[PDB]
Design a protein around this ligand. Structure first.
Ligand SMILES: NC(=O)c1ccc[n+]([C@@H]2O[C@H](COP(=O)([O-])OP(=O)(O)OC[C@H]3O[C@@H](n4cnc5c(N)ncnc54)[C@H](OP(=O)(O)O)[C@@H]3O)[C@@H](O)[C@H]2O)c1
Ligand SMILES: C[C@]12CC[C@H]3[C@@H](CCC4=CC(=O)CC[C@@]43C)[C@@H]1CC[C@@H]2O
Length: 325
C-alpha cells in the first residue's frame, strides 16, 4: 500500500494528507535557534511531505524558512507540502480567527496553509500571553462558543487562505456541536489527539470514522515526557516489552513499530525529532508491515490512560477529558 514515494490518504473535503509528518514542538528555552528549520529541511530531504506546527510553538518562522528554501531549490513544489497550523485558545473570539491565521501566513511567508485546526476546545483570555493567569496563578479563562469560532474558521476556507479545516483535543460532544451546527458549511476533516499503543483511542476513532474524520496522532511516540505535562511515573512507551520484542523481530526500533502500527490503521502520525538520525529512523516505516495478529497484540497494550491529561485546565467548561471519549 503505502510507500515512501506515495503515502497520502484522502480527507473528506477532497484534499489528501501525508500519513506521516514531522512534529515541531520543542521547549522554547531549551532549543537552539535554527534547530527547527534544520530539522524541517532534513525531514523534507528524507521524504517527509507533512509538517505539523503552531504559532505558539514559537518557531513557526523557522518552519516557513525551511519550507520556502526547499521550494526555492526545487526539492518540492508548494502543492507537494502539507503544513498544519493551529488556532490557540487566546484567539477564539470570532473576530480574531482570520487575523490570527493571517499572522501565521505572514510568519510562514506562505499564501495558505493546508490544514488549520482549533488547537484546544477551551478559550482563554485574549492577550499577549499564551497562558494567562492572575498574580494568584489562577487561570484567566474566556467563555467559549465553538460554533461561532468554527464559523470564522469556515470564512477562512471560503477566502482561500486554508485548504482544510479541523480540530484538536476535541471529544465526541464537542465534535457533535460542530457536526450538528445549523448551517454547517465545512465539516472538520481531522481531529488531532494523543494516540499510540498505550492510548489507542478506539471509541473516538470509530466515532471519527463514522463521520469521515481522520485522526492525527500527536505524541505518537509517547511524548518527550516533560514532567510539567506528563506523569513521568507512567512507564515510557518506547520501553514497552512487546514493542521492543516486535522491534527485534523486524530489526526495527520500538519507535518504528509504534509508528507503523498507527499508520497501518489509517491514523496519521506526526512524530517530532530534531535529531537527524531519528528523523530518518522514524520515516523508515514503509518497508515492513505488521501482521493482523501483531496488530491485535499491539492494540491490546491500550491502557485507556493518556500521557497528556492537561490537568491544569480540568475546570474549564470545555475541558475535553472528563467524558469517556
Ligand atoms: N495539538 C496538540 O495539542 C499537540 C500536543 C502535543 C504535541 N502535538 C504535535 O505532535 C508532535 C508530536 O508529539 P510530541 O512532540 O509531543 O511527541 P512525540 O513525537 O511522541 O515524541 C517526541 C520525543 O521523542 C524523541 N524521539 C523522536 N524520535 C525518536 C526515536 N526514534 N527514538 C527515541 N526517541 C525519539 C524526541 O527527541 P529528539 O527530538 O531528540 O529525537 C522527543 O523527545 C508535536 O511536536 C506537535 O507538532 C500536538
Ligand atoms: C502545546 C502545549 C504545550 C506543550 C505540551 C503540549 C501537551 C503535550 C506535551 C508533552 C510534553 O512532554 C512536552 C510538552 C507538550 C508538547 C501542550 C498542549 C497545549 C499546550 O499549548
Amino acid at each position: 500500500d503505502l510507500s515512501a514515494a506515495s503515502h497520502r490518504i484522502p480527507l473528506s473535503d477532497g484534499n489528501s494528507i501525508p500519513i506521516i509528518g514531522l512534529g515541531t514542538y520543542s521547549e522554547p528555552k531549551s532549543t537552539p535557534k535554527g534547530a527547527c528549520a534544520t530539522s524541517v529541511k532534513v525531514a523534507i530531504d528524507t521524504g517527509y511531505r507533512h509538517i505539523d506546527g503552531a504559532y505558539i510553538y514559537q518557531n513557526e518562522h523557522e518552519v516557513g524558512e525551511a519550507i520556502r528554501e526547499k521550494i526555492a531549490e526545487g526539492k518540492v513544489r508548494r502543492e507537494d507540502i502539507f503544513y498544519c497550523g493551529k488556532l490557540w485558545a487566546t484567539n477564539h473570539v470570532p473576530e480574531m480567527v482570520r487575523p490570527t491565521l493571517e499572522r501565521t501566513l505572514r510568519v510562514l511567508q506562505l499564501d495558505y496553509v493546508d490544514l488549520y485546526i482549533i488547537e484546544v476546545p477551551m478559550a482563554f483570555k485574549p492577550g499577549d500571553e499564551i497562558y494567562p493567569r492572575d498574580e494568584n496563578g489562577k487561570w484567566l479563562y474566556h467563555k467559549s462558543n465553538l460554533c461561532a469560532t468554527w464559523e470564522a474558521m469556515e470564512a477562512c476556507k471560503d477566502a482561500g487562505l486554508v485548504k482544510s479545516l479541523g480540530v484538536s483535543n476535541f471529544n465526541r460532544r464537542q465534535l457533535e456541536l460542530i457536526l450538528n451546527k445549523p448551517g454547517l458549511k465545512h465539516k472538520p476533516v481531522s481531529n488531532q489527539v494523543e494516540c499510540h499503543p498505550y492510548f489507542t483511542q478506539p471509541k473516538l476513532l470509530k466515532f471519527c470514522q463514522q463521520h469521515d474524520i481522520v485522526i492525527t496522532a500527536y505524541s505518537p511516540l509517547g511524548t518527550s515526557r516533560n514532567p510539567i505535562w506528563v506523569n513521568v511515573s507512567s512507564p515510557p512507551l518506547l520501553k514497552d516489552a512487546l514493542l521492543n520484542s516486535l522491534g527485534k523481530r523486524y530489526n526495527k526500533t520500538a519507535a518504528q513499530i509504534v509508528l507503523r502500527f498507527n499508520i497501518q490503521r489509517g491514523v496519521v502520525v506526526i512524530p517530532k525529532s530534531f535529531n537527524l538520525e531519528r528523523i530518518k529512523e522514524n520515516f523508515q516505516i514503509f518497508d515492513f508491515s505488521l501482521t493482523e495478529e501483531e496488530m491485535k497484540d499491539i492494540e491490546a497494550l491500550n491502557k485507556n490512560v493518556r500521557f497528556v491529561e492537561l490537568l491544569m485546565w480540568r475546570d474549564h467548561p470545555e475541558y475535553p477529558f472528563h467524558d469517556e471519549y
